[PDB]
Amino acid sequence: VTDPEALLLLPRLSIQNANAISSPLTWGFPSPGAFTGFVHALQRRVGISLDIELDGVGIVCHRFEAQISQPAGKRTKVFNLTRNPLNRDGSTAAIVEEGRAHLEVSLLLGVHGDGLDDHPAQEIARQVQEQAGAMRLAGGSILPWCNERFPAPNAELLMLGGSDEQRRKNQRRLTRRLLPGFALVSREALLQQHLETLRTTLPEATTLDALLDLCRINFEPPWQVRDKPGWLVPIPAGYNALSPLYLPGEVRNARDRETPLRFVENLFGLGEWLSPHRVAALSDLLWYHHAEPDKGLYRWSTPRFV
Amino acid sequence: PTWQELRQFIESFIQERLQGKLDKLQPDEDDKRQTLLATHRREAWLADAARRVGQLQLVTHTLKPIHPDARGSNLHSLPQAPGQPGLAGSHELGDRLVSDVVGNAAALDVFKFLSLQYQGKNLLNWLTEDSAEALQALSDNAEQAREWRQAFIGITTVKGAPASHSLAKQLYFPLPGSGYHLLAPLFPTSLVHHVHALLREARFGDAAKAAREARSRQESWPHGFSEYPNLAIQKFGGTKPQNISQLNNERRGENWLLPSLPPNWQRQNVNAPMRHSSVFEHDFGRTPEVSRLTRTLQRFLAKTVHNNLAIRQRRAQLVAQICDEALQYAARLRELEPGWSATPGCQLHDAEQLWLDPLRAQTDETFLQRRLRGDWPAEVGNRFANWLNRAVSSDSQILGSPEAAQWSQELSKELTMFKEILEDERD
């Protein structure tokens, strides 16, 4: 929402069992809500001590390996599970299917505040890396890079540049540093205009049909595949209200009795895995929160993408 | 719209239930027909059915797919539409709600009774709008009719205080000012059933199987078809998917998740050229994706002008994706493998000098690093332009027209940005 004064780069973090189930309709890379909740956890744990405000994540995903397996004779896939403990009686517990995946992402945390001036850049970069080393990103532990070739350090890029050329130089230097991955942005205006063209073709078509049409490899007869611009994916773009907002000590069995609970439901927007130098400014492509809590509509996106 | 036809329709449903019970009774003695015709025939069937409603619940967002030892709250609530454009889910269903049932499966006759389609709509939807046709048929006294109507309407209400079990999910959300909201999400099962119906119609439907066979005939069909690759199946009940919900009997588990995958979700291993034949076959090292991308550029030859505008924007996008995949191939080859400085030979295409960035500088300090920083090897783009001239054919309908000018200008600006990205490998 606001512009970051600096752009921190947490380097390639190895996540071993992330959540492959991003949403009820999407499997694969975990939801960007996990990464925005991670940067809010980082702000809640060391952001208040350094007098900075870590907002926004650029999700890069150098490596992804889902713990899946294609069954024999089926085109679809199934998830490799774990073995839960037995019950108190000795029988096998009722299995619940949780998708696990191995990640390697690097995060662009947009850091703005009055703590960039108090501390050096390398100190606050090192302290948020040490705080991220004892955390988890989507349910999966962050592997801490022991006894390898060399440890990947951080770089807090002060985005306030003296010139346009030095700014473009350090943006290119950072893009070369997070290069083999694929930045994730939220392209929802493309989904809405594809819904507009779909409704032009056939009326009363809703945007779930436009989302599914942007998802699949659909064929057209003269046979030619309808082309897709980029790697468009369905992503859960936040939540939506189902119940009115309850009081803190009102709902039963909540997490805490001091925070208002509201029953919610996902909102599957459209995302687009694009390469990091297709953006020409890394102060875009960061994932912020947008709540508007009177209406529901607790959503996350990349504002200022285009 | 009159109460007499609704009355006789309800009596016909009750009598069909009793006739099915008597036909599947296999009785000859014990006089159970008297008790069955006293209970399951009269308007006391409405009485014990209205007693049975509190065992059921019409739901749209169940909890039980989240870990099935969870006794929380299940909601039949449709969200309001976001004013923000783009994103949507489960509020698009206006007249296509499938409307799951949770609760005691022994009381499913109440839901089958409220789901009869008597005039033009459900009996339940007749009971929500209090009319003359409603609340006159299901009794002769309006007091117990009002009581049974209030019972039947309660099939879509939350029973008890709102709750979410310790095994359920509930997630803090940072508000703009301060504070959080707990946000316990519920599994949208009517939306999952709708997307599951769309996916089953597009995969196993007859109108898609016909076009799929017409593709194998190589003939012409009116409509096309979809494919939906990389779907993952998630079943909710382990061995008993009956114990989750109503529609989880129809889709036996089987959530059918769409793929949200990054493009490097298939690990490609790295290979550097060793010998002269390896340097002739591995100078390019062309992945399946760039061949899939150049085959699309090969299908972008012919054009009419109003289509050639979008075709030129698509050709610019494809050359951008090819150049960017070349940049990522150079990136992962220069970073992952030390094989560019593994062995010496006679032919390794040493004019490239881009896929061996740390290989010739971090070991040789003044030998090749002084031949890469002052020379700044960026002549790889001129050799890379030969690949994209091989991607296009010899079509003279564009070579003797202004399409070659637009092609050359987009190629020049794209090799310009490829050159300035390739220029500063030294920093």
Place this chain on the structure above:
Amino acid sequence: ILSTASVLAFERKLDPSDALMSAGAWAQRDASQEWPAVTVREKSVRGTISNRLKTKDRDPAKLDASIQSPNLQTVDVANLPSDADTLKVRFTLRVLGGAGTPSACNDAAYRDKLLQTVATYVNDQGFAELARRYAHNLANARFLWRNRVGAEAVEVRINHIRQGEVARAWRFDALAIGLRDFKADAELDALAELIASGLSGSGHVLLEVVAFARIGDGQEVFPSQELILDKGDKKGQKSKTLYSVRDAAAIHSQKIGNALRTIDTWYPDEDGLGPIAVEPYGSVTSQGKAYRQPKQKLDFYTLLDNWVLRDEAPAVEQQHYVIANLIRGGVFGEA
């Protein structure tokens, strides 16, 4: 009245990674950074049937016709190469810290009571009995699960990875240290104080646990096996899938954690098993039997409720079990 918090959840302390297994030769274990990874490859197996016939298939005709239609499987195997007799199993371990602070708790009164209880434990008897046993399951290579049963010599090397480098390096003989005796050893005590200072402070202590098992040339090593329901049709069915991280066999993270948690020798049943895993209603998956039943007053929930709510402090062994269940993590709470 201080009723039980309806939501309890503890974050997993002692969080290991996948145990990547790579192969090579003994007497160059000190140069083991370029050892090639043990790859998971397929092989085909024919079997004649051997399951117990259910007294209706004991006809000679049906059995003879069933040994002429054999089952044709495709199993995954992980073998050492023909010129390698040593298995380097290498994983990382974060000993996180904050072992009594729950990850989710409803009641602030229950939360403060539980934190006062765990602080009473840590002040009276800190993590020195638990961490000795975690250091033993690191020291003897119990995390080498079936790769230990006939190894010639197992040697475990543990490095306290500091900021970027090895701060303190251990080297154990994992066959001299048994699988059922938690004795006291000086280097094991130093590792126990390191895991103690990891479990007490707010920062994580990172170890690198490398174990070498001299199995033999070309022999089979045993990585973890993936739980795949719906294998598919029986034609191309792969009946056994071994876990591989990236063309490299590995034991799962929860399997290494299950071998590290095998410290519980305090259960009321006799110790024919010796130590079992720290579980609530402490249950052994291989035995198919849940010890520490709720019928006796010795499971984790009743010991925790008597310790926190009504101040009945259990025995020192049972509160070792309770705090080891807190370090293990979990999801608890009533409706």
Place this chain on the structure above:
Amino acid sequence: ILSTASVLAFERKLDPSDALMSAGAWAQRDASQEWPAVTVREKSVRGTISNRLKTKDRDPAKLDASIQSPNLQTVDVANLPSDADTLKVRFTLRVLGGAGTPSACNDAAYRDKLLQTVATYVNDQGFAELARRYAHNLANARFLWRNRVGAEAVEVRINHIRQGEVARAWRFDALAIGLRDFKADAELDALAELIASGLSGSGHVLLEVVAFARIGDGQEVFPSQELILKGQKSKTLYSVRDAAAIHSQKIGNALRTIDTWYPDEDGLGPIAVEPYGSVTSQGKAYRQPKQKLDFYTLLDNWVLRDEAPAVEQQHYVIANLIRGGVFGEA
């Protein structure tokens, strides 16, 4: 009442490796560490019809029409080179020990009774009859399955591998030691004592079994064959890393051909130790459960109700426990 456990998982003792095969010349078998491996290569074959017709294909018109269009295939063959006549099949055998202890069991009483039963077996008579037969199946090269049937002279070298070096090296003539008679030698009894000490848990036994089979110049050798998913690829051969190999369970099945106690005639000789003791080639299941001599009724009579069988049948039962398996009902 001591019913049988619902899981009984026995580990595989006598754990072999994939039998790699190389190639070289005889009389330099002693310097056979650098011999080139027998690579599996492809070749096309052309088959005519030779199967039994099903009384409707006996019309000469369709017979000649199907002969006129014969089936092409692409088999995998592994032959010795044209200058080599000896096949060096080299595997390692690790003898584990702890034969009667199951890896998984529900009942503690049944597990204890099984441990007492195997323990009173071992105390009454060690693993001396079993290890003599395992040592014979190592000495006579039955693990050379079809590479033995026409070999001129087979020689098996078995080395006890200690720390990294050879503790005691054997050298047998695999054709003098027959395929069906279990005689007694001095070196075979020393190998039997070594495998006995391996199975009793009183030592670590890692043998490296090398077997040279003088087949002939350029002849065909037979590794194990994979299952198959114009160029129909009718035979896919096993290969570990560009080197033909025999499967580990094939070598284990050849080592377990010690069972000469099956109730039928002993004209066939030893068969493989299996419950419902069966040979998949001959298609006949000896020790059918009608007769009281399969593994399951013998174990359930020896452990549950203490009807101890004869010495031969309990040798067979402990040979099945050394083999390992998935026993126990549902």
Place this chain on the structure above:
Amino acid sequence: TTFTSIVTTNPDFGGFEFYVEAGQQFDDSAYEEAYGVSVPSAVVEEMNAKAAQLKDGEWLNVSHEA
């Protein structure tokens, strides 16, 4: 095909489980209508003997594991 049974005092009405009321009888028609599978006729008398032998306020949970 394995029709288990458990007497529950409080039922789990959040899922689609089959609970028989204490003062009622098993209904094979309702089980064949709710779930797709039909009850075999040898399970019915066992479920009747369990459903009749029920204290007031004790539900009979009937489920198959096919």
